[PDB]
Structures are given as structure tokens and as C-alpha cells.
Design an enzyme around this catalytic site. Structure first.
Site, PDB file in Angstrom:
ATOM      1  N   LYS A  68      -8.986   2.568  -0.798  1.00  0.00           N
ATOM      2  CA  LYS A  68      -8.182   2.879   0.381  1.00  0.00           C
ATOM      3  C   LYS A  68      -8.316   4.338   0.830  1.00  0.00           C
ATOM      4  O   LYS A  68      -7.689   4.754   1.827  1.00  0.00           O
ATOM      5  CB  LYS A  68      -6.718   2.525   0.123  1.00  0.00           C
ATOM      6  CG  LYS A  68      -6.500   1.103  -0.426  1.00  0.00           C
ATOM      7  CD  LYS A  68      -5.017   0.847  -0.651  1.00  0.00           C
ATOM      8  CE  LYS A  68      -4.744  -0.562  -1.115  1.00  0.00           C
ATOM      9  NZ  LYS A  68      -3.256  -0.770  -1.237  1.00  0.00           N
ATOM     10  N   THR A  84       0.825  -1.234   0.000  1.00  0.00           N
ATOM     11  CA  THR A  84       0.000   0.000   0.000  1.00  0.00           C
ATOM     12  C   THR A  84       0.840   1.257   0.000  1.00  0.00           C
ATOM     13  O   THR A  84       1.924   1.312   0.621  1.00  0.00           O
ATOM     14  CB  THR A  84      -0.927  -0.023   1.221  1.00  0.00           C
ATOM     15  OG1 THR A  84      -1.909  -1.059   1.024  1.00  0.00           O
ATOM     16  CG2 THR A  84      -1.744   1.277   1.374  1.00  0.00           C
ATOM     17  N   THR A  85       0.317   2.270  -0.675  1.00  0.00           N
ATOM     18  CA  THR A  85       0.870   3.617  -0.611  1.00  0.00           C
ATOM     19  C   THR A  85      -0.279   4.634  -0.461  1.00  0.00           C
ATOM     20  O   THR A  85      -1.226   4.644  -1.250  1.00  0.00           O
ATOM     21  CB  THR A  85       1.694   3.888  -1.907  1.00  0.00           C
ATOM     22  OG1 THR A  85       2.760   2.929  -1.988  1.00  0.00           O
ATOM     23  CG2 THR A  85       2.412   5.199  -1.839  1.00  0.00           C
TER      24      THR A  85
END
EC number: 3.4.25.1
Lengths: 203, 222, 222, 222, 222, 203, 203, 222, 203
Positions: free
Chosen positions: G33, G1-2
Site C-alpha cells: 500500500k 487500511t491504515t
């Protein structure tokens, strides 16, 4: 983290740096680790951020309530005793913190409190990963006869030295002076920076 | 105590209200960027310490209350309000709307009118302060009924004081003029020949903490 | 309080309904792809702050309620309804049928007519909003009896407003005309020579969130 | 409420039955490989939604109930029946004998006639559906008393409907004839000249799920 | 035990106060940097032990109480004050303001006037001591009502003693002159020709701990 | 185990195999891993059999209750949110499962729900030890434009491939198609065998 | 994830990618997200998907309750404080997440919250496995004086660099801009792609 | 039971005192370095095991009690006193001051005059023993009221016995002279020509444990 | 830590040093480890600081309560028994302390209490890391016939010896003498210091 509290004739001086890390990863250059918690009372925090922040909120709230109920500020020793009871009660599931509590009642006080609720009064104390470097500066340079102005320079030096040698310390130095005459005063950033220059330092 | 009469009345609550009517008069009013409270004290004997057990109680630096009716019931309710304010500040970091604090107190009171094995509180409160919306003034009675006001009163001289303010009250007066109006309103409620001794007075303005007027500053209005 | 009479009546519940009859009048009606609520306000005096203690209470963005009777009891049910709405949204991601929410509130009221040691709530409610089925209008009384309506009223002017709507009400009006009809039905319940001061109004149409008419929006009707 | 009279009667339970006598008439009957429910429907205002809060309620796809008496109490018993049917299905994988469901419901009612600090439910229910034994028809009263039937009724018209069926009822009718006997039987319980509006009708036959007759399909039998 | 009368009175609390008027007389008064207490007692028999005589109870080294009314109720509240004082000392390391102790005791008494299933304590108390504010003197009654005093009294001789003190009390007396004044005050409450036997006396001054005047020191004032 | 769910324009297609092992030991050649749980809703199960069977019974019971209470079917996303809440609530004592939930409300949906209650919508998904093999077939051959008969062929290919390379997968392929016009339709075995015959496959 | 959150003069910009992995296995290429949790408030989530999704639902629910009760939006700092209390209260059985909270009250704010409830305000912040690559790009190219269009270009770059180097990051970049004038607005996909092209990038 | 009368009386407590008055006379007195108890047996029927259900009860080796009033309540209180003594000894290693034990028993009695749901104990007790302060003698009534004495009595013949001791009691007597004075006192409480038949006698002196006199030793004193 | 208590004919002498460490880190040169807890009773503490501090507050409070209730002081053996019960009741979650209880009731008494509530009376006793050194001095030089001034010199000698050889012991030496005639009397520092010179010693 580095934090420091010193007493002088009629003053308490408290200071921190501001680095927030996760291991070697510098996440925040600029967190807050020094708090006013009552009219003449300040607290610094070291250790687990979440636990320390919960403690700061409690203490602000409880010291305000106590003051309303009693019509006098909680004595500094009473603040430390309160914290000492709270942390010890949960010593097997602890607040993973070191705390300094400093302020003025009839006399200046600095208290050092550990995660088991061990609370001990001292003329000066230091917490966080940077504290052994501070203790070296203070052993060598601290005097009970210092003025506020030289006490301020002392803690900037001590924290400057900690920042130089502790990678978990860094950022702008925060200073507060506590007196009966002025209450709790956070020195403005430009005054701290002026001092850093005059004394020959960096960051 | 928790029983409707055939007409839909809760007689225990209306009896709780009779107790409130016996308390001494207090009032609050909004003025330009602030709010103030004034409490009448019938102080009695010279053997009393007058410097304590005050009618205007700080809930925190930005909120104050005054009460009328059963003194012991009132104290327990003020304690509740202080603690409840602290819980909100711990939870959110601040108290954004005083109205939510007043509702939690009024909810505690409502509940003592609905559950058996318990009598209502014999109390009325006025809450005054500044939150993120502005200066606030609310009242709260034995039933847990609340209203927000520009000006209001509780205690034996309630109706006199409110008659006076209905005629005389204007919005946005300076602090000095509002105090004067209030002092005057309070005097109107008294029996003639009956004089008015040192009332309690407290005020707050936007950006500040409450000040309680010292015994000297109150005189300059009598 | 939880007791049958020889004819099988619950008199305590019937007495709670008496309290509801003293409340201020409110109504709702469905119109074309929508539903609205209008509340009368018994305005005390100019000292009362009007921005405040709204008669129309949003439960979430798609659902609102208006109540009549014991004001503290109503506040407690309205809190209950807001939280109960949030619990459904957390559980399923949304609130599919508004009637299940009204049933949860009505269940809580029903219980207070069956267990000893409490009295019933002295409250009636109208709920209005949009869900998957479409625009909804329910009422709910101290017993926890619920009905779905096209148009309905609660409070002192209930019987007047209802008789008016029974003659005057038409399905699928445009909003403007629904509102106008509603204002008319309210005026019908007033004592002769008594003047409609300016009600609360709120409407919702499919696809949209609730709108709360402001004072000058309501003016174009009064 | 949980007290014997000198002749061994429970008058609170007898008074709850008085509430039941006041509700709208409903009936059930077994016919060949099936069972049906019919409910009298008191429309009574054009402002009411003619859609929801039905008298006939599905417990699951194979079992339905209809009730008479206090509507809120009835709603709570139906919710209990639904949840209790699901508990059995989860536990055993299905619902073998509908009578056990009726007993859990009746037990919960019995308990409220025995323990202090509660009043009985003012409700009678008819349950109907199909299980491993075949088509079932039960009644259940405020006491928790149950009986299995070929045909039965509840509500104000109970005595007439039962009279009529005791004379005219016949085992193993086909669906249409059963429904026709049922409707006639419901017509006989009314006051002279007062007309029968749209009743609710539901039926179930072995190896099928319930169906609810639609408005149009009911009209056919009138 | 917790009911309002139509005039907003709590008669059970008023009756608990009648119990207090029957007890022996005690008084306290502040003086120059100090506070003292004086208690009468009717010892009847010579078969009684003097010296176990349970009147003027130390709460801690800096705080003492006398009580009047039901002696067993009083003993329970004195134990409560003792434990409550210790809990505060352990939490904060000391007791900053005696008023908070008196409030906890009074809060315990208030609750017994509000919750059913329990009667009020039939006791009044006087508390006297030194804290960070200076010398304190409080009283507390069956309702949980408290006042801070310069001088006060409880018990059957209360009214006489207060009358006397109201005429004769002056602040900042030396301890000797205060004790003398207290003795005169107490003597004035007696029957005619009725001699005052040895009372208990206790005082405390800023920077010291309580002293109990011994048997013979008291006699010097008689 | 191998299960898969795919969305097409107005259809959902879900499918599984049926092997039940205790390590290498083939206890049951013909287990059931695909279930209708509402009028327009199917679920597949992978993981611990006892856990997954308990969940199927709850889901059938709850969705039927909700339908009776709301007089509409629970939306597919709501079913996934319900499951997501349930599993997360017990995440430190988990249902050891991976679930697929598929159906049509206003649109077709496939959700994949893990043992901590993590739920994600996708156009297709697969679970069980056999899923990587399936993901290979789908990546190469899936098209959003496929018709139902094509999509049915695809999932048969995908599962047949998994059966060849995953020894914890085996037995007859089970397929159900969900549309608004027809509801949930479990395809007859004879029809699946005929497609396996047609397409040129085995087992 | 970023994920990343930046403040500008009168703006907050927030962004994520969309990859959901189970170790190396790319289960979903398009998870979500980034969420609106209040009128002028967004949240990003990293870490255990079930915990994060549970928290997204609590927060949407609670911020709506609060706004109905208070008649104003919860101040951003109050949101961070609430979350911070929730996560700390369960620190020994934690939500396994890092959260970013961003929005406007009287000013723009970005807060970073950890699994123990530590919350720190910053001018910008990043979470997930991809965050150290983002911090590289932000250190080098962030300026407080940037416009909104520049800020949006900045976060696309930072996330595009993270995706290139962090195999647990991938899929379409998601961006939201929050202002008083326009509230929370998520940028349309075609607008993000258009910027990806103009900047000379991929995925 | 826990209710104040208008004069502030607790009638249930006063009625429990009436049951105490019907019990047999017992007394205790302090003497040179010691303390004794004498209890009128008042038996009847040669069919009772005399020397079994003893009125004088050891609490431990150093403390004894005698009771009057309801015998079953009394047994329960004596059992409570025994367990409470051991608890203190386990905690501190010994029982330093008997008064605290008596207070714990008295507190248990007090509770039963304050809380609804229970009646007071219809019991009075005398406790006699030696602690680290010296020989002790207390009594304790239904209210939980306690006193320390040089001599005292309980039961039907109390007033005569106290009256007599008030005349005849001398301080520091030898044990044998104390026991005689006690038998004298007890005889005086009997009606004309009524015959004192063997009381129980028990005594203790500093440095020893208790001795119960046996039947042959008491006859010597008659 | 080093603490010691000795009985003489009608006297108890108790003494400690003042060093508080965190491993080798000397935090406080001058902590307090000797307390009066009743009119004729002192207590010394060793082990975990927050635990010992909580115990000293409890004992001050309970012995005061007890004295008011009983109107005599708790006997020294009763004090040791109370502590025994307390520490034993939490033996599996213990106060991590060694305690000495000393005082006068009808005779002088020194009790040594451990973390499981074991209590043993002795003529002399020592606790903390420096105690083996004190036991050496005491074995060699203690006499029951010693006067108070000899007793005082003896403990100064024992703790000075301990300070020399236990790096966790240091700082000024604290002495109290307890008699029936004079109660509990803490000796003034200048008087301890003077004796350190006349005996020939250090810190």
C-alpha cells in the site's frame, strides 16, 4: 466553512476560516479558502474541495491570459459573468461550490455566485455552513462608513461568531484587504492574532 | 511542402526562412541573474499608433517572446504559446521548465512542415524568461528547430548582431551594461547614416516579474 | 511520396536518408555486460548554451537514443518513443524486450512512407539499453528498417566510424576500453587537422541505471 | 497508384513486385505429413547481431511466414497476420483453414492497390503450417494474389529455385530428404563460386508444433 | 494557395490585395474624444436604391467597420465580426478592448492563407469605435495583418488619401473640423473635374453610441 | 465453485472442482475451470461462466501473441497487470469473475485478481463460494517446505473439504503442477482418484 | 487500511499496514500500500484496490516521463495538483480512493487527496478505516521537533494502535523515510520488528 | 476555382457570369405601393407543356424570385431560398426584412467561390416582395453580390432592358402602367422584327399576396 | 419573486421587487429582475437565477444583433417566439424560469413565457411566487382606460400587496414605462418612493 466579503468606500475586505471536514471528522485544521486571482481580485471558496480548487486554478489562468490579451484587468463584474456562464453551462452536472468574487476596478465590488451560475452583487455577502451567523453579525454591526481597520475587526468578529456556533468552521482566520493604492494584501497572521486579542476572542 | 528534394532538403521550410529574414532585428541576452529582450522597430508613418501591436509579447509574467517574419502567422503562434502556458499551469500548478513550452510551440511548427494541405509558419521566435532552472533564452524557427542561448538574434540584421556579440559578449554583466551591449549590438547591424529610433526593451531578474522599459528609460541608452 | 519507381524504389524515402547523412556523428557499442553511446556535437559558437539540446536522449532509466538528421523530426520521434515506453510499462508493469519499443517507433516511420499527405521523417536513430535479454543496440532509419548491432554509427562520419569498428571492434571490452575505442573511431571520421571538441558519452551495465558522463569525465579521453 | 493502363495493367503493383525480386531467396516445400521453410540469409557484417530480425517468422505455433521485399512493409504484414490469427482463434476457438488467414492478409494488400492516397506493399510472403485439412503452403504477392503449392519460392533466386524443383521435386519425401532437396535447390540459384552461408530452416509435422532448426543442425545439411 | 515562393512571398495573398485596390475608398480618423469613418461609393444607376447601400456597417452600438475589395467576402467577415462581438459580450458582459475583436477577425483571415482547399478573403477592413481604452481605429488586410491608426484609408484612392492625411492630419480636432478634413482628403483622391457625390459618414464620441450622419447632414460638408 | 493455487519452492500447484449450477440446479457435473494459458502459466476461473470463458480465450491468445513478439514468455506479474488493467477498464460494466493466475518465471507466483482489477500476490489463494473452507484447510496445514506430492495432497484435501460443505462445489478434482523442468502438467484423473483413495476421501 | 504521512525538519516519513479484506474475509495479509513514485516521492493508497493500483502505475509512468522531459523532479505540489486534476475530471465516475502524497523538493511535504480531487497540504495525515486511531496517537504524541528515529517510532505506534482497533487493518508495518541526503528509503522488515519489540508491541 | 489571378480576379466566378448571360431576360420594378416581375418565356416546340417549368417562382406568398443561367443550379437555389424562408418564420414567426433572406442565399453562393471541391452556381436571381419595410427588389449574382433596386434585369437582354429603363422608368406608377413600361422595356431587348410571345407576369402590392397573371391577362398587354 | 406587466393604450408598464432567497434565507435584499433588452422592450425574470441571467444576456445580444441585421427592432411577438423556440428545445433539461416580455412595436404587448416555451399574450400578466396576490389587485382595480400615472400606481399597489403576503418577495420596487415617444424609461427610486407615501404603503 465560513467566508465573507465586504465593500467599503475604496476597499474590499475578504476573509475565511480554514477547517476541512469529512462529516464530523476534522481532517485539516488549516486549508486555504481565500485566493488572489488577479492584481485587485480575490476569491473565496465553499463546498466540494476538488471542484472549488479546479475553479481557482482556472480563474488564476484565465484572468492572467485575459490581462495579457486585453492589457487591462478583467472588470470584477466580468469575472462574475464568466463564472456565472461556466457554472450555468454545467448546471445538471455542477461544480458543487459557492463562490465570492471581490475586487477593485473603478469601484469596489463583491459578487456572490451559486452552483447554477446565479451571480448577484451586494455590499456584503457570506458563504459556507457558517454564513447565517456571519449575516447576523453584519446585519447588526456593519456600516458603509467604516474604515478598513474597523471593517477588518468586523469580519474577524463575524467569523469568530461563526466558528463558535458552526462545527464545520474553525482554525485561523485569513484576511485580505484590496485597494487601488496597495493592491491585494493578505494581512499577516500575527496582525490578525493581535486583533483577536484586542477584541477579546479565541482560536 | 512536405517533400524532400534529392539532396534531402525541405525547400518550403527554407522559403519560410526567407520571410523571417525580412523582419526587423531583435535580440536577447542573459546577464547576471536575468535575461533581456531588445526589439528594433521600423515604425514608419506618423499616422500609426505607436503605443500598440508591440514586438515584445508577454507569454506570462515570467516569459516573453519576440518574433520576426509573417506578422499574422506570428500572432497566431504567440496566442498558441499563451494558451499552452496556461494549460501547463492548470495541469501542474506551475511551469517548471520553459523549455517544454518552447517545444510545444516548435512541435506545432514542425507539424506544418510534415503534413500536406498546410504551409509552414513564416516565423522565428525568441523566448526569454525565468523558470525553476534559471533565466532562459531559446530561439525557434519555421522548421521547429530550437536552441538555448546566452545571446542571440532574429530578423534582417541577425548576422551583424551575432558577429558583434561573438566578439563582445561577456557573461554575467549587470542589467545596465548588458542593455548597453545590446543597444550597441543592434546599432552595428544598421546601415551607417541610418539612425536608431526607440527600440523596445524588456528584462527580468530571478525573484521578479518582467518589466517593460518605458519610452523614457530607453532614451537613457540611445 | 508513397510511390514506387519502375525498379521498385521509394525515392522520397531515399531522399529522407540524404538528410540523415548531414547529421552529426554518433555511435554505440556493446561491451562486457553493457552498452554505450557517444555523440559528436556540431558546436555553433560560445553564445550557444551547452548544458542543452542534448544529442543523447534517455527514453527511460534503462534505454537511451541518439539521432541524426532533421532535428525537429527527431524530437517528435523521441517524444513518441518516451510515451510509447510508458504505455508498455503501464500495460504490463515493465518493458521486457526493447526491440518491441524500437518496432513501435519504426512502424510510425513506416506509415509515413505509405500514406499520402505526409512526408517521411528525415531521421535515423540508435537505441541502446538493457532489458531481460540483456544489453541491446538497434538502429532505425527513415523507412522504419531496423537492425540489431554489436557496434554501429549514424550521421556524416557513419562510413568512417563503421569501417574503423569493422577493423578495431572487439566484443566484451571493459567499459573504459570500449569508451576509448569509441573516441578513437569518432576521431577517425574527422577531417585531418580538425580537433575532437568533446563528445557526449553515456553507458549502462546490467543491474544499473544509465549514467551520463559529465564534461570532466569525458576529458580523461580527449 | 490505383490506375489502369490502356492494356489493363496496374503499373504501381508491377513496380512493387520489382522490390520483391530484390530480396533474399526463400522457399517452402511439402514433404510427408509436413511442410518446411528455408531462407537464404545475407549475414554481411560482423558488427550485426546474428540472432534477431529473422526472415522466418512464426505467425502462431502451427503457422510460419517468410517474406521478400521492403522489410518494414514486411514487418507490418507479419504483425497483421499475427493479430489476425489470434482474432480467428478467439472467435471460433481455433484456426481451421490457414487459407482464410492468407486471404485476410492478401485482402489488406489488395485494398492498397485499389484506394488512392496509399501505395501497395512491396512484399511477397510464403505461409506454411498445418490445419484440419493438413500441411499447407501458400504464396501471396503485392497484388494480394495467392496460390497454394507443393513447393515454391520468393526472392531474387525464385526462378532458379523453381526451375530446379520443377525438375527435381518429389511428393512425400521424408523430412531429411526434403531438407536436402531444398538446400541443393537453394545452392543452384547462387552465382558460381559464391558460397551458401547458414540458411534458416523450420519445419512442422502433423500433430506437432513448429521447430526452428538451430545453427549447428542446419550446418549438417551444407 | 498557401505556398511560399523562393523569396518567402505568398503570392495568393498579394493577389487578394490587388482585389482590394479595386474597391471604393474609405477612411477613418481619430479626433478629440472620438473617431469617425467616411466612405465613398460609386453608385452608377439611378435605378439603384440608396439607403440599402451596404457600406459602413455597425458591428455593435460602439463599433463600426468599412470594407474594400470583394463585397460578398466582405459581407461574410462583417457577419463574423457581429457574431464574434456578441459572443464576447455574452461571455464577459462586455467588450473591453476592441483590439481583441479585430484579432479574431484577422485570425480568421490568416487561416485562409495557411490551409489549402480555400482562397484568402479579398478584403481590407477598417474598424473604429470606443472601448475602455478610449477611441480606436484599426485596419486589417487579406493576410490578417493589423495596425492601429490615428488616421488611415483603404480602397482605390488609399494612396492619395493617406498622402493628404500625412500632410494635413492633426490630432484632437473637433468633430466638425475632422469631418471637413476627411472630405477634403477624400476629394483629393478623385479624377480631375470629377465631383464627389454624397459619401457616408459616421462618428462616435466617448460616452455615446454611434451616429450615422443622415443624407442631409452630409450635404452640409460638400 | 472452488479453486486454489499454492506456491512451493520451485513449483506452483493449482486445482478446481467442476460443478456448474444455476442456483440449486446442477446443470453440469463436469465443467472446466483450470486452463493452461502459457508454457508455464495456468489460470482458474470463478464467477459468471460466459465472462470467465471470454477471458480465458483472450489470455491464451494474448500470451501467445506476446511470446511470439517478445521471444520470451510474459512474466507472471505482467500477466496479472495485463488482467488488472483489462478488468479495471470496464469496472462499471465488469467481468463478474475472480481469477487465479499461477506460474513460474524466475520464481513461482500466485496472483488473485478481482472484478475491479485488484491484483495481489500471495503464497496461496482460493476463489469461489468454496474458498472459505479451503482457507481453513490451508491455514491449518500448509507449509512452505512441502514437496510437490504433499502440496498435491493438500489441495485435494482442501477441495474435498469444500465439496462437503459447499453445495455449489462438486465433481472431479482437477490438478495441474507447474515447474520449469516439466512445464504445466495436468495430472491424470486416475492419479487424482488414487490419491483420494489413498488419503481416505469421497465424491 | 491504515496509512500515515508525517513531515519533520528535513524528512518525510510514510507508513501503512498490509491487510486486504473482502468485507470480513481476510484475503491477503500482505498487500502493498506504499510505493515509491519518484526519486524523492512516495504515495500511499486506501480504498478500491483496482483503482489505487491503476493510479500507482499512471503516477510512476507520468513522474518518470516528466523528469525526463523537464530534467528535474516534479515538485510535490505539482504531483498533488496533477492527481487532483485527474480525479476531479472523473468525479461522477470516480477512482474510489484516498491518496497520500509525500516527499522533498526544497522542503518536506505531505498532501492528502480525495476521490473528487480535493488536495490539502498538512504537517501530518492519515487515510483508511484505521485513520481515526492514528489521528488520536498523532494529536497526543506528535511533535514537529522529533527526530527521524522518533518519527519512525511514532508511526509504528500509531499504526499498531489502529491495527488493535480496526479489523480492516493488519499485517506487517511498512515504513519509508525520504530525505535529500538518502532519497526514498524503505526500512528493512527486521529494523521495523526490532522497533516493535523495543517499544513493547505486536503483529 | 477559388483562385486569385495576378490582377485579383476570380475567373471561375466571371465564367459563371457568362452562363448567366445566355439565359432569358427577366426584369422587375417597383411601382406605387408595389413590385412586379416580368420574365421572357422564350419557348419553342408546341410539344413542351407551356405553363409548367415557370421562371417566376414563389418563395412564399409575399416573396418571389426569377432566375437566369443554369436551370438546374437555379432550381437548387430556389429550393434553398424556400427552406430558408420557412426556417426564419418558424424562429421568429415572420419574415420582417427580405434582405436577410437574400443574404442567406447570397452567402451560400459566396461559399462556393471560396472553398475548393465545388464550382460556383451559374445563376443570377432577382428577388421581389413586400416585407415590414415596404416593397423590395434585389438581385444576386454568382459571386453572391447583391443590390437593391427600383428596377433591374438579368439574362441575355439585360443591357438593353436596363438602358431602356434608365430612360423610361418613373417612380410611383400604377400597376397597369408599370406592367406596360415593363413590356416596353422587354421588347426593346429583342433583335429586329423578333416577336415577344407571352411573358410570365407577377405582382404584389402592400396588404396583399402575390398574383401570377394567367395567359389571358398578359395578352392584353401585348 | 413578484413581477408584473400591464398594457395601456400606448404604453407598457413592467415592475418587480428585488428579493433573492435560498429557501427562507434572504441572500440579497436588492437583486435586479427587470431589464431593458431592446429600444422598446423589457423583460422580467422569475425562477432559477443563473438560468434567468443567462437568458437576459442572450436576449440583449440577439436583439442587438437582430436590429443591426434587419435595421428594425425585433417585433415583440417575434421576441416571445424566439424565447418559445429556445425554451422548448431544451424542455427536458429546462431553463427553470417564467418570463414576461413587454414592449411597443405598432402597439403595446405583454407576453408570458413558461419553462417549456409556452407563450401567451395578455393585457396584463404576473409571475413568481407573489403573482396570485397581484392577480387579486389587478382583477379588482385594473382598467384599460387608465393613464400611465394610474398604471404606475396600480403596479406599485399590486407588488406592495404581494410583498405583504409572499415571504419570497421584498425590497425596493422597480418600475419601467415603455412608450414610442420616450422609449423604455426606468423610473427613479425617489419617484417610486414618493408614490409609495402618497398611496400609503411600505418596503
Amino acid at each position: 466553512t465560513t467566508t465573507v466579503g465586504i465593500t467599503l468606500k475604496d476597499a474590499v475586505i475578504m476573509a475565511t476560516e480554514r477547517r476541512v471536514t469529512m462529516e464530523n471528522f476534522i481532517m485539516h485544521k488549516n486549508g486555504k479558502k481565500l485566493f488572489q486571482i488577479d492584481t485587485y481580485t480575490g476569491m473565496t471558496i465553499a463546498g466540494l474541495v476538488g471542484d472549488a480548487q479546479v475553479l481557482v486554478r482556472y480563474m488564476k489562468a484565465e484572468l492572467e491570459l485575459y490581462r495579457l490579451q486585453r492589457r487591462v484587468n478583467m472588470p470584477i463584474e466580468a469575472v462574475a459573468t464568466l463564472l456565472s456562464n461556466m457554472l450555468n453551462q454545467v448546471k445538471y452536472m455542477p461544480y458543487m461550490v459557492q463562490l465570492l468574487v471581490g475586487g477593485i476596478d473603478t469601484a469596489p465590488h463583491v459578487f456572490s455566485i451559486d452552483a447554477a451560475g446565479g451571480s448577484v452583487e451586494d455590499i456584503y455577502a457570506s458563504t459556507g455552513s457558517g454564513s447565517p451567523f456571519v449575516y447576523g453579525v453584519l446585519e447588526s454591526q456593519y456600516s458603509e462608513k467604516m474604515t478598513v481597520d474597523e471593517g477588518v475587526d468586523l469580519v474577524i468578529r463575524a467569523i469568530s461568531a461563526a466558528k463558535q456556533r458552526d462545527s464545520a468552521s474553525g482554525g485561523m482566520i485569513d484576511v485580505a484587504v484590496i485597494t487601488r493604492k496597495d493592491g491585494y494584501v493578505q494581512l499577516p497572521t500575527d496582525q490578525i492574532e493581535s486583533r483577536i486579542r484586542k477584541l477579546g476572542l479565541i482560536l | 511542402i512536405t517533400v524532400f528534394s534529392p539532396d534531402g532538403r525541405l525547400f518550403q521550410v527554407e522559403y519560410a526562412r526567407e520571410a523571417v529574414k525580412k523582419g526587423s532585428t531583435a535580440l536577447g541576452m542573459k546577464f547576471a541573474n536575468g535575461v533581456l529582450l531588445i526589439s528594433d522597430k521600423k515604425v514608419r508613418s506618423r499616422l500609426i499608433e505607436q503605443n500598440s501591436i508591440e514586438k515584445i509579447q508577454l507569454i506570462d509574467d515570467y516569459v516573453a517572446a519576440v518574433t520576426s517574419g509573417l506578422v499574422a502567422d506570428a500572432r497566431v503562434l504567440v496566442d498558441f504559446a499563451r494558451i499552452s502556458a496556461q494549460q501547463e499551469k492548470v495541469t501542474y500548478g506551475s511551469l517548471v521548465n520553459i523549455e517544454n513550452l518552447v517545444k510545444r510551440v516548435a512541435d506545432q511548427m514542425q507539424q506544418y512542415t510534415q503534413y500536406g494541405g498546410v504551409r509552414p509558419y513564416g516565423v522565428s521566435l525568441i523566448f526569454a524568461g525565468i523558470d525553476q532552472i534559471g533565466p532562459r533564452l531559446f530561439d525557434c524557427d519555421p522548421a521547429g528547430t530550437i536552441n538555448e542561448y546566452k545571446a542571440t538574434a532574429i530578423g534582417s540584421g541577425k548576422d551583424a548582431v551575432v558577429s558583434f556579440l561573438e566578439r563582445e559578449y561577456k557573461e554575467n554583466l549587470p542589467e545596465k551594461e548588458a542593455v548597453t551591449l545590446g543597444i550597441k549590438a543592434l546599432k552595428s547591424s544598421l546601415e551607417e547614416g541610418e539612425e536608431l529610433k526607440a527600440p523596445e526593451i524588456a528584462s527580468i531578474t530571478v525573484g521578479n516579474k518582467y518589466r517593460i522599459y518605458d519610452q523614457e528609460e530607453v532614451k537613457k541608452f540611445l
